[PDB]
Each structure stands twice: as structure tokens, then as C-alpha cells.
Amino acid sequence: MATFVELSTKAKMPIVGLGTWKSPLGKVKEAVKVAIDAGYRHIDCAYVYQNEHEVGEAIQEKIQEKAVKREDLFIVSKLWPTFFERPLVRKAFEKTLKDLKLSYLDVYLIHWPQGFKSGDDLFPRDDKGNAIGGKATFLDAWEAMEELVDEGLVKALGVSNFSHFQIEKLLNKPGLKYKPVTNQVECHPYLTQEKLIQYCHSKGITVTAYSPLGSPDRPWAKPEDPSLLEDPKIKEIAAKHKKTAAQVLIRFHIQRNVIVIPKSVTPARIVENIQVFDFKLSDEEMATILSFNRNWRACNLLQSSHLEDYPFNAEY
């Protein structure tokens, strides 16, 4: 049973959730079932993961078997930037909701701030592999997403991969109806996000930490890239508590009041990753982990740096 972080809407978002990026069909259903059995209530999904239909099946199973009630689940999905045009926001959301077999989403996020070429080519690219932009902006998207909230199809909106400049742009938009309840960004001891977390919290916006284990399975990983799970200094703190490195990496965020969404399809690891409420990292250990900051991104998306709303050029 995970604790919660209170949102500005007073909704309670479970502080540990299950990630589903790259969770294969044929394993993601069982993964979600095991997670719910283990006490997970928060599941992080996305249209672009192309597995929401199988996540939906798992959720429906557990509900109809009395393992969990819908009101106790916390389901998050994301709008992909090829769908920022108003009519496409609705169509994309409807596909997400139908796949998940749900009547509503708890949170719906703008997945990335830069608009891409509109349509169902999810990764429109040139010959070099650079993203092709679209003229519809995240503000255009937000307008259409606000309708879903008006209609009760989504309880709250949020953003992902936004810098403080972009969040400012959103918050300071004249005629804003709903405010973002979270900003989901990469966060871990190599990218501690101190300034961005400080900013978000000061605006009543929570932070959701993605790739908390450093996303070791990411396709573009090079053998020289830093590895959090094998970091001797992380492992030292784990050993001190007779816990795993993964558990330390997860507990790190909990103690900063930051939501964290580790991904696994491995039953043992799914359980392991939520066994993080029976120990505490000391003040000194937290400081030590914070000192590991390298401003290193596993998810740099250099292929889109040429587009207007590239979030990672700013300091925070």
C-alpha cells in the first residue's frame, strides 16, 4: 500500500506507480495483474506505447474479480504531439479510453511540449531521423483537453517534459480553465531536477519521476552511459539497509515527495519495487544521493532539438 501525494484538486495520487513503456503484449497484462495484487493502484500509460488495450484487459479483470475498485485505481495516460490539432485530441483520447476500457482517466498529460506533424505517423522524421514539426502547439492541445475535464472524462490535466518556461507559458495563458496537477519528467540521482522540482512545488504542481532506474533497457543506450543500478555508491546505500539498488532509487523520490513510476514486467521486480515503505534513507544518505547529479538524461531526444518548444535547452 503506497502513500499519496495530494494534488491541487485534492485528489490523492499514489506515490509509486507502474510504468508500462516497452512492456510487451503478452507480458503487460500479467504485469498489471501482479502489480494490483502487490498493492499498486497507480498505472502510467500512453497512447504511443501501443499496449493500452492489454492494460485495459488487466484492469477490467481485477475489477470484475473484486480485487480492486475503479475509484481506488489511479490511471494516467498521455496525449501524443501528433494529435495537437483540436479534432485529433478528441480522437486520440477516445482511442486511449476505449483501449483502457475505462469511463474516465484520473490524469491526462501532454506527453511532450513540441508539436509534431499532425496525423497517425507517430514518429514523423526526415532522412536523418529528425522530428518533423506541426504548427499546432501545446496550448492548442490544452484547450481541447480542458473539454474532457468539463465532460468528466478526465479528472485532471498535467504535463510531461515541460521546462519551467513552458509551465509559465501555460499558467500565464489568458483564459486558462484548468491548471496542470503534475509535471512528469525524468528524475534520478544523475538528474536530480532540484530547480524544476522547487519551481513546480511552488506553483502547486507535483512532480512524477520517470526512468527512475535510469531506463537500462532504452534502445539507444551505449555501454559508456552511466548505469544507476550498478553504481557502487548507490549500491553502498542499498547494502546499508539490506535493500536493493532499485529500492533505494525509488525511495529517493518518495522522500522528496515526488511520485515515481518504475517499469517492470517481471513479477519479482514488480513486488520489489513497491517494498519501499519499511525503511528510510537518512538525511546524510539523501544529501549524498543528491550530490550525484550530473545533469544526465537517458531521454535527451536530440532528434527534436531544432523545433521551437524544445524543453531541454533551458537550465530548468
Ligand X SMILES: NC(=O)c1ccc[n+]([C@@H]2O[C@H](COP(=O)([O-])OP(=O)(O)OC[C@H]3O[C@@H](n4cnc5c(N)ncnc54)[C@H](OP(=O)(O)O)[C@@H]3O)[C@@H](O)[C@H]2O)c1
Active site residues: 49
- Asked if 230 touches ligand X (CB under 6 A), the answer is no
- Report the residue from 12, 95, 125, 169 that binds ligand F49 according to the rule CB under 6 A: 125
Q: Exposed/middle/buried for 313, CB within 10 Å: 0-12, 13-18, 19+?
A: exposed
Give which of ligand F49, ligand X, none residue 272 binds (C-beta under 5 to 8 Å, depending on kind). Answer: ligand X
Task: Spell out the residues 6+ positions from residue 203 whose beta carbon is closer than 8 angstroms to its own.
Answer: 167, 171
- Asked if 129 touches ligand F49 (CB under 6 A), the answer is yes
Residue closer to ligand X, measured from CB, 102 or 265: 265
State the residue for C-alpha cell 506507480: 17
Residue closer to ligand F49, measured from CB, 99 or 285: 99
Q: Determine how many CB atoms are found less than 10 A away from the CB of residue 49.
A: 19
Chain positions 32 to 61 lying near ligand X, rule: CB under 6 A, are: 44
Report the C-alpha gap between 112 and 76 in whole angstroms.
Answer: 15
Give which of ligand X, ligand F49, none residue 54 binds (C-beta under 5 to 8 Å, depending on kind). Answer: none
Task: Spell out the residues 6+ positions from residue 90 whose beta carbon is closer than 8 angstroms to its own.
Answer: 144, 147, 148
- Asked if 132 touches ligand F49 (CB under 6 A), the answer is no
Confirm or deny that 77 is annotated as ligand binding: no
Do 78 and 51 touch, CB atoms closer than 8 A? no
Confirm or deny that 57 is annotated as ligand binding: no
Confirm or deny that 37 is annotated as ligand binding: no
Rounded to 5 degrees, φ, ψ at 149 are: -75, -45
Give which of ligand X, ligand F49, none residue 129 binds (C-beta under 5 to 8 Å, depending on kind). Answer: ligand F49
Binding region for ligand X (CB under 6 A): 19-21, 44, 111, 160-161, 184, 210-217, 229, 244, 246, 261-266, 269, 272-273, 299
